[PDB]
């Protein structure tokens, strides 16, 4: 029902803020992106850059993906990201997350035409 590209934007793009403002960011954002619907998604990263800047990573440093495919790309620049990780006491359907704001390089896998991110591989 959802393209891979659209799922990437839903799970990983938050161009509306420049950083997580509070320790409640992940709690709110995981819910509003439907990442707590059926189960609590344990770990998820949001990127606080323009979509154009993130899509441009598909023309930057080509690297292998964790799965061994070679359509992964590392951002040349660091980007503003938020890492969201469920707490050890979190239990569905009251999913709870720790927020960690950082500036890091992102690694995404790209596919399709237009050649855009379809997977978030890691931050470094
Ligand atoms: N080279 C490839 N090209 C095309 N798609 C691929 C490739 N590698 C993995 N995917 C797939 O893209 C989907 C979206 O992933 P995400 O939900 O964005 N990332 C996982 C993290 C992850 C990191 C490494 C490996 C797996 C998971 C996550 O957010 O929890 C996942 O279901 C992957 O199987
Ligand atoms: Cl992978």
7 strand-pairing partners? none
Neighbours of 65 (CB within 10 A): 16
Q: Which two tokens stand for residue 108?
A: 């995404």
Total domain count for the chain? 1
Centre of ligand 1 from the C-alpha of residue 61, in Å: 18
Give the full edge-to-edge strand order of the sheet including 72-74.
61-63, 72-74, 106-111, 116-123
Method: X-ray
Query: What separation in angstroms does the CA of 81 have from each of 28, 60, 76, 115, 123?
Result: 16, 18, 15, 22, 9
Instruction: Quote the DSSP letter at residue 1.
Output: -
Beta partners for residue 102, in sequence order: 81
User: Is the Cβ–Cβ distance between 74 and 123 less than 8 Å?
Assistant: no
Of the candidates 18, 99, 105, 117, the one whose C-alpha atom is nearest the C-alpha of residue 58 is 117
Domain range enclosing 87: 1-124
Give the Å distance between the CA of 66 and the centre of ligand 2. 4
Give the closest ligand to the alpha carbon of residue 121. Answer: 1
Q: What residues form the annotated binding site for substrate?
A: 7, 10, 41-45, 66, 85
* Burial grade of 59 (CB within 10 A; 0-12, 13-18, 19 or more): exposed
Alpha-carbon gap, residue 93 to 100, rounded angstroms: 22
105 part of the active site = no
What whole-number distance in Å separates Cα of residue 39 and Cα of residue 91? Answer: 9
């Amino acid at each position: 029902k959802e393209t891979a590209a659209a799922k990437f934007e839903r799970q990983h793009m938050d161009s509306s803020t420049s950083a997580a403002s509070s320790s409640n960011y992940c709690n709110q954002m995981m819910k509003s992106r439907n990442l707590t619907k059926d189960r609590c998604k344990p770990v998820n990263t949001f990127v606080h850059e323009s979509l154009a800047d993130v899509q441009a990573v598909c023309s930057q440093k080509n690297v292998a993906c964790k799965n061994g495919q070679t359509n992964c790309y590392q951002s040349y620049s660091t980007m503003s990201i938020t890492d969201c990780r469920e707490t050890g006491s979190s239990k569905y359907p009251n999913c709870a997350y720790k927020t960690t704001q950082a500036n890091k390089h992102i690694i995404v896998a790209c596919e399709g035409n237009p050649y855009v991110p379809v997977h978030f591989d890691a931050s470094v």
